[PDB]
């Protein structure tokens, strides 16, 4: 299926004592591969996935210098955004930044990203056209013009449409045994009594990868998309994912309902009943 590479940056200010805690993580699809942490002992770009360890020291030295560059850019962004919004210095604040690119099944560019947030609220984001920005409040309009005067979006289109796609293709090829696998979900279903005149049926899906899965209930034979509960896909702790879906069924009619699982690791979508 489609693939993506995302880089996440977070610098939280420790008011008074303590320099800003800076964390930088790189992702391919759902798994992290690189990580930097100010509180870590290495002070370098540490590996987090097996396949990137093919890269030599020239890679790790160049990436480490670039992370420490982003560490200072965001250390100034904290002071710049604290003064624009006119805020106290005894209070902590959080700047977040994400840029990356998506590709389809044919590994061709789909869309790129370059977004920013202050304390978890959308600050400025690169639009779909990779040209204009999305600024809501005036402190983001100040940054919008500042990035328009410096031609930021024009300088990033080279990275988003090319450099990002090239490295993602190398990552998908060096780690094809990890990033291109499809573990089929091991499925089962349970029936627990909720009360009289009703009872629930929980459709499970375990030990699958990637996290993209579709679990819909069907009551002979239409979807019950409204009155159904669907937990967020969660990590199992061993690289796979878990998810379930449940419906409340009046007693004696559990056999009329049926669950349907759709996943990349399944040649045809499965179907289970009581």
């Amino acid at each position: 299926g489609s693939h993506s590479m995302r880089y996440f940056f977070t610098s939280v200010s420790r008011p008074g004592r303590g320099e800003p805690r800076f964390i930088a993580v790189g992702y391919v699809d759902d798994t992290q591969f690189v990580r930097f942490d100010s509180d870590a002992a290495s002070q370098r770009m540490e590996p987090r996935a097996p396949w990137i360890e093919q890269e030599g020291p020239e890679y790790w030295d160049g990436e480490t210098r670039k992370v420490k560059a982003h560490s200072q850019t965001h250390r100034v962004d904290l002071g710049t955004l604290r003064g624009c919004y006119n805020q106290s210095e005894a209070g902590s604040h959080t700047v977040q930044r994400m840029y990356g690119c998506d590709v389809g099944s044919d590994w061709r560019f789909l869309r790129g990203y370059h977004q920013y947030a202050y304390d978890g609220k959308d600050y400025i984001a690169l639009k779909e056209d990779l040209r204009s920005w999305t600024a809501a409040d005036m402190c983001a309009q100040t940054t919008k013009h500042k990035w328009e005067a410096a031609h930021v979006a024009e300088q990033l289109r080279a990275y988003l449409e090319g450099t990002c796609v090239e490295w993602l293709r190398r990552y998908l090829e060096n780690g094809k045994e990890t990033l291109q696998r499809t573990d089929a979900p091991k499925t089962h279903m349970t029936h627990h009594a909720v009360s009289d005149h009703e009872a629930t049926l929980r459709c499970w899906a375990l030990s699958f990868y990637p996290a993209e899965i579709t679990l819909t209930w069907q009551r002979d034979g239409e979807d019950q998309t409204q009155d159904t509960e669907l937990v967020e896909t969660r990590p199992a702790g061993d690289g796979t994912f878990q998810k379930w879906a449940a419906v409340v069924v009046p007693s004696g009619q559990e056999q009329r309902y049926t669950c349907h699982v759709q996943h990349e690791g399944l040649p045809k979508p499965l179907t289970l009943r009581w």
Binding site: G26, E63, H70, T73, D77, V95, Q155, T163, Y171
Partner: peptide
């Protein structure tokens, strides 16, 4: 892989 030229706010 990482973006070299990052711009401040």
């Amino acid at each position: 892989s990482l973006l070299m030229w990052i711009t401040q706010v």
